[PDB]
Amino acid sequence: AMFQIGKMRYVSVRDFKGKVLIDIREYYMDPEGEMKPGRKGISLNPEQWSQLKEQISDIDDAVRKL
Amino acid sequence: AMFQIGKMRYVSVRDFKGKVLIDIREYYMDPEGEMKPGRKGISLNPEQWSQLKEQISDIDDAVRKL
DNA sequence: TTTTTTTTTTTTTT
């Protein structure tokens, strides 16, 4: 499943080799004319994603103040 | 501002060259004994961060179904 | 070999 968050950026959810990854990732268009994941991104495991969600309120507080 | 989401992973919030960035990134310990940002990570702008949050429910549903 | 916004490019450590 892919969830667009910008022009060339997605959160993607996939099973990779038995484990669920939540990937926040910029994509590019390659010379053969296909969409590929780029170097800018990180694949989170479910516990890291859970910790991120738990800190959204604090993250938002910091964003708001800048 | 730093928000830990794993042993060596953080969300950070900062103003860089006049732009607020929400960076999700893996860090490492370098040979001099200092923490440094690593190559696995992505800096979101606030609009991307807002779209990510908007889709957490859908992302979470994908995780349950994969 | 190691950041940082809408070419040379994936994939999990509290």
Residue numbers in the entry:
A (entry chain B), B (entry chain A): 62 to 127
Q: What does the primary publication say about this deposited structure?
A:
Sub1 orthologous proteins, including the human PC4, have single-stranded DNA (ssDNA) binding, DNA unwinding activity and multiple functions in transcription and DNA repair. Nucleic acid binding is the key factor for Sub1's function in DNA-dependent processes such as transcription and DNA repair. F77 is conserved in all Sub1 orthologous proteins (Interpro domain IPR003173) of nine key species, while W89 is substituted by tyrosine in the proteins of six species (rice, mouse-ear cress, fruit fly, nematode, budding and fission yeast) as well as MoSub1 in Magnaporthe oryzae. In order to determine the effect of tryptophan/tyrosine substitutions of PC4 orthologous proteins, we have determined the crystal structures of the DNA complexes of the PC4 W89Y mutant and MoSub1 and analysed the effect of the W89Y mutation of PC4 on DNA binding affinity.
In order to evaluate effects of the W89Y mutation on the configuration of DNA binding, the PC4 mutant-DNA complex was crystallized and its structure was solved at 1.97 Å resolution by molecular replacement. The asymmetric unit (ASU) comprises a single protein dimer and two ssDNA chains. Each ssDNA chain (6 or 8 nucleotides) is bound by one subunit of the PC4 mutant. Comparison with the structure of the DNA complex of the wild-type and that of mutant PC4, yields a RMSD between equivalent α-carbon atoms of ~0.4 Å, indicating that the W89Y mutation induces little or no apparent change to the main chain of the structure of PC4. However, although the wild type and W89Y mutant of PC4 have the same conserved DNA binding motif, the DNA conformation around residue 89 in the mutant-DNA complex differs from that in the wild type complex. In the wild type PC4-DNA complex, residue W89 interacts with two nucleotides by hydrophobic and base-stacking interactions. However, in the PC4 mutant-DNA complex residue Y89 interacts with only the dT5 nucleotide base that adopts the same conformation as in the wild-type complex. However, substitution of tryptophan with tyrosine in the mutant disrupts the hydrophobic patch and also results in reorientation of the nearby residue, E93. As a result, the second nucleobase does not move close to Y89 to form the interactions observed in the wild type complex. Additionally, the analysis of the DNA binding affinity of the PC4 W89Y mutant or MoSub1 to the same d(T4GGAGGT4) and d(T5GGAGGT5) oligonucleotides showed a similar affinity with the wild type. They also had the same trend of increasing affinity with increasing length of oligo dT, indicating that whilst the mode DNA binding is altered as a result of the W89Y mutation it does not significantly affect the overall binding affinity to GGAGG linked tandem dT5 or dT4 ssDNA repeat sequences.
